[PDB]
Structures are given as C-alpha cells and as structure tokens.
C-alpha cells in the first residue's frame, strides 16, 4: 500500500497549572518523534500546550492533510472519556474543567476524514475515565465509512493509563512497549496487537492498564508504507550557529539544539579571547517576555540545570514555549571583560527570526 505523504502531530502535556503534573510525556513524545522520522513521517512535536495552542496545532496539521495522506496524532497527557468520546486536557484547563476546555478526538477525526486521508491513526496515551463535571451529551455526525481508521489507546475505557513515579527518563507504560515495535514492517493493527501482548506482561499494570485497539482499516496499511508544506518542514530546522565578534576582539559562539518543535536550547561559549583581555564572560538576556523565561534558570553550566535532559563547556538556556512567540526571537548577548591594567560591559542584539514552530505562523 502507498501513502501520498505521511504526517504526524505529537503533543505531550505535563506542566498542568491546576492538575497533577506529569513527567514522562517529555521523553515519550521525544522518542516517538524520532521513531516516526525514521519512518519518513513529517513530524511536528509540541510540549505543554494551552487549549488555544492545541487547536492551532491541530489546525496546522489538518492543513497538511490531503487525499491519500497518512495522518497520525499522538497525545500524552491528561484526558477523559464520556460516552465514547475522548477528550484531551490542555495545560491551562481550570479545575474543574469540562468539554469546552478540552479537545474532542472524534471532532479531529471527522475533520481528517474530510481531507480524504488514506490512513487515520490516533495513539492516545491518557486516562479514559468519565469526567463527572461534563454533563453534555453531544451528538456528532456519524462518520463516513472510510475503512481506514485505527486507534491505539494506552488503556481501556473507564481505566487509567500510567507512567512510573521517580523514574528519571523512563517512558510511560504505553511508549515503553510501543517504541520496541513501531519500526516493524507490518500492518499497523498487527503491530499494536503485538504491543498489547507485550504490555500484558507488565506486572506493574496488571488489572489497571491494557492496550485497546479499535480498527476499521480494511487494507494492509503500515507506518512503513512508501510515499509515492515547506513551512511544516522548516518548523524543525534550527537556526545556524553563529560566531559573534565583539569590539574588544572577543568572539563568542552561539549554538542551538532542538528538543521539540517548541523547545530550543541556546548555548554560548568564548571561542577567542585577545591576550589584552585577562578574563571575560558572556551571557544571554532580554528575551521576549512572551517566552516567560526565568533568569535563575538561564545561563547554566549544564543543560540538565535548565531542565533539558536530551541535549548532549558552555552556558545553556532553555527556551520552552516558542509557540507563544508572535514576533522575531530577538535577544541580547552580554559580554563582561577586563584588560590587563584594570570591568567593561558591551552587548550585541541577535535576531534568529521565527525559530522552529514559529515558522508555521500559527498566530
């Protein structure tokens, strides 16, 4: 079987303002992003999205879908399910929240079917208990019979999906098993069936979590199927490294690394210091307030100190929330230094345009 293209949107929500925070969606999304890119999916991955941001991301994703395209959505975070409709909870959801605060997966599926996709895959790594605060009984239009829909639910209806407490960079349960099968050249339904059996051997989750597969897929389609727009591609291209030269002769390298489509690490280092100058330090400051950075967290001697655990003699700064950037990413590189024969302060403003997810101009 053939795909016209293969496109995936992955969202991991962790840092909930009003609900229990999670940890493993970060590694779950990061690892699945890498696996899907190995399968030639065009992937956008996003962490910690508000309702507005989730809807925008989904809209961009729907725009890339067209006749014969394979579309895949993976979501790791809080969720619920009322009357067979599944809902994904954004990080800004109030407590309590209801349907109007959340995205209904069935609504997204309907929109995907309208683009005449060749395959629709939903991997929902979230709890599926009822939300007692949601008393709505919405009737969505019956879906067309396109016979090309597959759901892999991390857990069953009315049950919870889990990650492990105090487990460092361990995956959640679903991804722990999914990651080891995803590259198999097999119909997606069979691949998930295997994952369900693997998960059936996980003692931690016996009686609490079991994969559910739902499929009407009537052709032998697989995530490995051969493929037989520019902005979506550019949304994962980092800014080029740059070598800033300051008036005094000091040059500072400025580098970038990607964690997610909305999370970038900037690092600086001194690459040349004139003999004149006995010592110098450079650091980054004055970032757009929209990014909501804390300076006690920036300019750290280690990436993990910024909360960046997937990075690897510089200073590191984590820019999460790039999706909130409405203008160019402009910031200052400050330099302090001294000449043999006594402290000076200079600075240089840098503009790296619209990095990563900002390329989609979701706003």
């Amino acid at each position: 079987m053939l795909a016209k293209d293969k496109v995936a949107l992955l969202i991991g929500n962790m840092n909930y303002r009003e609900h229990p925070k999670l940890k493993a969606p970060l590694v779950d999304v990061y690892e699945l992003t890498n696996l899907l890119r190995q399968l030639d999916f065009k992937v956008v991955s996003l962490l910690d999205l508000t309702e507005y941001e989730m809807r925008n991301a989904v809209d961009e994703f729907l725009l890339l879908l067209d006749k014969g395209v394979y579309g895949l959505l993976y979501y790791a975070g809080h969720g619920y399910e009322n009357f067979g409709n599944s809902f994904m909870v954004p990080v800004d959801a109030p407590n309590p929240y209801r349907s109007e605060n959340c995205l209904c997966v069935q609504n997204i599926l309907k929109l995907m079917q309208e683009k005449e996709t060749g395959l629709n895959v939903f991997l929902l790594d979230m709890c599926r208990k009822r939300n007692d605060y949601d008393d709505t009984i919405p009737i969505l239009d019956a879906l067309k019979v396109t016979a090309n829909i597959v759901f892999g639910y991390a857990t069953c209806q009315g049950a919870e999906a889990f990650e492990i407490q105090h487990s460092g960079l361990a995956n959640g349960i679903f991804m722990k098993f999914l990651k080891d099968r995803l590259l198999e050249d097999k119909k997606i339904t069979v691949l998930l069936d295997e994952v369900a059996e693997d998960m059936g051997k996980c003692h931690l989750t016996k009686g609490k979590q079991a994969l559910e597969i739902r499929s009407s897929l009537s052709e032998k389609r697989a995530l490995t199927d051969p493929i037989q727009n520019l902005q979506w591609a550019k949304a994962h291209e980092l800014p080029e490294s740059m070598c800033l030269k300051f008036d005094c002769g000091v040059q500072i390298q400025l580098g970038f690394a990607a964690e997610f489509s909305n999370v970038m690490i900037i690092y600086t280092s001194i690459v040349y210091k004139p003999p004149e100058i006995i010592m110098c330090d450079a650091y980054v400051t004055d970032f757009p307030l929209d990014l909501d950075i804390d300076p006690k967290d920036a300019n750290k001697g280690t990436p993990e100190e910024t909360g960046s655990y997937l990075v690897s003699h510089c200073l590191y700064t984590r820019l999460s929330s790039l999706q909130k950037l409405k203008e160019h990413l402009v910031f200052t590189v400050c330099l302090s230094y001294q000449y043999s024969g006594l402290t000076v302060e200079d600075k240089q403003e840098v503009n790296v345009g619209k990095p990563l997810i900002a390329k989609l101009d979701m706003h």
């Binding site: 229990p20 999670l22 940890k23 790791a76 975070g77 809080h78 969720g79 790594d125 979230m126 709890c127 991390a154 919870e160 999906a161 889990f162 990650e163 492990i164 407490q165 959640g172 349960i173 931690l204 989750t205 609490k208």
Partner: peptide
Amino acid sequence: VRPR
C-alpha cells in the same frame, strides 16, 4: 505509578 502516576495516572494520566
């Protein structure tokens, strides 16, 4: 374990 921590539920989602």
